[PDB]
Amino acid sequence: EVQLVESGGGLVKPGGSLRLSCAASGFTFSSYSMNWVRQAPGRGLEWVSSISNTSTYIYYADSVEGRFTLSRDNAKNSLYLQMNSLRAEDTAVYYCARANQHFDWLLSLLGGYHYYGMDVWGQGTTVTVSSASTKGPSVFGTAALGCLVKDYFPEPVTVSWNSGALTSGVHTFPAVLQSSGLYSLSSVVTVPSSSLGTQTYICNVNHKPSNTKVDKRVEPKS
Amino acid sequence: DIVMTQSPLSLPVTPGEPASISCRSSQSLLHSNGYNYLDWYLQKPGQSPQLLIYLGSNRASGVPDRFIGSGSGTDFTLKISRVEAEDVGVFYCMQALQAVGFGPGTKVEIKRTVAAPSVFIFPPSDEQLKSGTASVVCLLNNFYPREAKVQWKVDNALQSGNSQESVTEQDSKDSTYSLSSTLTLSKADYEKHKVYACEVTHQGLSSPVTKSFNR
Ligand SMILES: *[C@@H]1O[C@H](CO)[C@@H](O)[C@H](O)[C@H]1NC(C)=O
Ligand SMILES: [Zn+2]
């Protein structure tokens, strides 16, 4: 496989620090510029830095200059984006990407069109910038049900149903930020009346950045 | 600096049938070196984006001919002849001129024959209430199009701005959406009223309906 892996990520408080690595195998790193790029949850794609193979012409977004530091190890096929001093708007996902070059001259004193071409991308790494931390309790033709999942930080949670026995009809909703800065969401499941009493259901919740995972028997009226 | 602009912001289209997106720039795009510094990217839903076009009109390796890509200067276009359901996502033009800057997006989604939602209220439940809160959820299933107007009500009385609503992404097989609408309350004002009800108005309804409960 030709592949690129981001790394690092993770939550740390504002004015925090993080070093995102990004490793590459399956091609000649040295033949390509590299590019960080972010997606704030909810928002659209925002270029971050670029850098060439000769590890020169480091560009940065105004939103990012003076706080992030694009490094490179063509002999160790990696990419390093040193992040300081982190603020809230810095929360996003970070892809490292392959990019073609095409260079100078009538750019600044000598510049690079760092990546018109941009054909390979890692999966991303997520960087969460806020305070505080920790889990959030669950609590809960056709008739529905599901679980609420609430008062949790940070993202994500993995809501499941009977560990997987319900793939059908499960509408598990994007998490929205309550004012308090803790999220919540609901995981529902569409089901025919019938099942109640014989079929009994349980929502396999898992929030890691918490060391919490539960699930809860939904059973209307008694 | 340059400002990338695209239109529309969402393009529900129908597989078989073609579609077009526009992207424009606050400055002209060509030179260094002849021809344009504009790529286009898809981001299919739940995925990293991928190269689509490059230097404005070049079709990156392993890309269907369905995708022509045109223009010069400030005005640009991604015309997809014969969309297929898998082309869903966000199209992002991108600008290679001074460094790198990304289109605001164009969200592509499937067109579909309207369809109304089923509705469902859920009571707080005495576990939340033990912990002192009252969230009252109200589901909306498998409706199209997205635009819906859910309205909460305590004792005939509307509410305003105590309700947040999520929406799942289009459904991959039936192309519907769903929607939570959560109205949160202090357990103290929860326990003090009886009639909880949400009142949906979707276009696939000849008049609103409401689910209701008491306690
Ligand atoms: C840097 O890139 C260009 C083509 O992208 C190549 O011609 C040049 O030799 C490269 N430097 C390397 C591979 O060290
Ligand atoms: Zn459903």
Numbering used by the authors:
A (entry chain H): 1 to 52, 52A, 53 to 82, 82A, 82B, 82C, 83 to 100, 100A, ...
B (entry chain L): 1 to 27, 27A, 27B, 27C, 27D, 27E, 28 to 94, 96 to 211
Anything the authors wrote about it?
The HIV-1 envelope glycoprotein trimer (Env), a gp41-gp120 heterodimer, is the only universally exposed viral protein on the surface of HIV-1 and, therefore, the lone target available for recognition by the immune system. Env changes conformation to facilitate viral entry upon binding to CD4 on target T cells. This leads to the exposure of highly conserved CD4-inducible (CD4i) epitopes within constant region 1 and 2 (C1/C2) of gp120, known as the cluster A region, which contains non-neutralizing (as assessed using assays measuring direct neutralization) but potent ADCC epitope targets for antibodies (1–5). The prototype antibodies for this region include A32 and C11 (14, 15), mAbs that recognize distinct non-overlapping epitopes.
In addition, we also solved the 2.7-Å resolution crystal structure of C11 Fab alone. Much of the difference between the bound and unbound C11 Fab originates from the constant part of the Fab (CH and CL), which is in a different relative position in the two crystals. The average main chain RMSD for the full fab is 2.92 Å, but for just the variable part, it is only 0.679 Å. The CDRs are ordered in the unbound C11 Fab and largely superimposable with the bound C11 Fab conformations, implying that there are only small conformational changes necessary for binding.
